Amino acid sequence: KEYKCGDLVFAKMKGYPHWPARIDEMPEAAVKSTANKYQVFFFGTHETAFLGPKDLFPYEESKEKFGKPNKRKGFSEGLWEIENNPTVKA
Amino acid sequence: QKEYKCGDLVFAKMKGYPHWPARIDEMPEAAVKSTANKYQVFFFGTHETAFLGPKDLFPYEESKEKFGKPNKRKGFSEGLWEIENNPTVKA
DNA sequence: TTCAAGACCA
DNA sequence: TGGTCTTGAA
């Protein structure tokens, strides 16, 4: 489990013996599509979306900052669920 | 912050909305499987490329006894020469 | 269709 | 920050 870029290995392809090989970088496109992509369920609205860590902030650790009441549809409901029904999972 | 875990409570920021109460779920199994434990391997001798899980990888040095013995397949001998003498070929 | 809070972009 | 657009509720 786990390899770094530039590790020397033997690699088994179907039909071939274990073969001398090197670990290279994956295609940038391939990594950008999943590296730091978490799925996010949203309380109140129950929608989800995919997000990177810039756009995520821990709750508890910032409920005075971002927990102030808000008029957008489902927000109050979201502040209730996260504190009262956090495992909605619906 | 980085490396969040499944079930972490967060505020989440989308375009046009305030910082929003959220939970981190699992990604879709398909999406995960498409890049989880998948390395881009380059093969010495042939210089072909593939994508492999750790199942199909064995470190060199640790196993040049087992797997490093002479073989008649196209490019294997060269391959054993390159991994020792020119491991940077990258061509 | 008014207005005010707040969300964007330059 | 300033200026404008949008949301939600009179």
Swiss-Prot record, chain A:
Subcellular location as annotated: Nucleus; Cytoplasm; Secreted, Extracellular exosome
UniProt PTM comment: Sumoylated with SUMO1. Sumoylation prevents binding to chromatin.
| Domain (PWWP): residue spans on this chain | 5-62
Q: Where is the signal peptide?
A: none
Sites bearing N6-acetyllysine, chain numbering: 37
Short sequence motif named Nuclear localization signal, residue ranges:
68-73
Q: Where is this cross-link: Glycyl lysine isopeptide (Lys-Gly) (interchain with G-Cter in SUMO2)?
A: 73
The record lists heparin as bound by 12, 14, 65, 68, 72-73
Instruction: Point out the cross-link Glycyl lysine isopeptide (Lys-Gly) (interchain with G-Cter in SUMO) in this chain.
Output: 73
Superkingdom of source: Eukaryota
**Quaternary state and interactors:** Monomer, and domain-swapped homodimer. Interacts with nuclear proteins NCL and YBX1/YB1.
Family classification: Belongs to the HDGF family.
Note what the entry says on domains.
The PWWP domain harbors the heparin-binding sites and is responsible for DNA-binding, while the C-terminal region is essentially unstructured. The N-terminal region does not contain a typical signal sequence but is required for secretion. It also determines exosomal location.
Its function, per the record, reads:
Acts as a transcriptional repressor. Has mitogenic activity for fibroblasts. Heparin-binding protein.
- Protein name per UniProt: Hepatoma-derived growth factor
Curated annotation (Swiss-Prot), chain B:
Q: Which residues carry this modification: N6-acetyllysine?
A: 38
- Binding-site residues, heparin: 13, 15, 66, 69, 73-74
Q: Where is this cross-link: Glycyl lysine isopeptide (Lys-Gly) (interchain with G-Cter in SUMO2)?
A: 74
Compartments in which it is found: Nucleus; Cytoplasm; Secreted, Extracellular exosome
| Motif Nuclear localization signal, chain ranges | 69-74
Q: Where is this cross-link: Glycyl lysine isopeptide (Lys-Gly) (interchain with G-Cter in SUMO)?
A: 74
Query: What residues does the PWWP domain cover?
Result: 6-63
PTM statement from Swiss-Prot or TrEMBL: Sumoylated with SUMO1. Sumoylation prevents binding to chromatin.
State the superkingdom: Eukaryota
Q: What family is reported?
A: Belongs to the HDGF family.
Quaternary structure and partners: Monomer, and domain-swapped homodimer. Interacts with nuclear proteins NCL and YBX1/YB1.
Instruction: Give a short account of what the protein does.
Output: Acts as a transcriptional repressor. Has mitogenic activity for fibroblasts. Heparin-binding protein.
Free-text note on domains in this protein's UniProt record:
The PWWP domain harbors the heparin-binding sites and is responsible for DNA-binding, while the C-terminal region is essentially unstructured.
The identity of this protein, by name, is Hepatoma-derived growth factor
**Organism from which the protein derives:** Rattus norvegicus
Within the intact protein, the region shown is 7 to 97 of 237
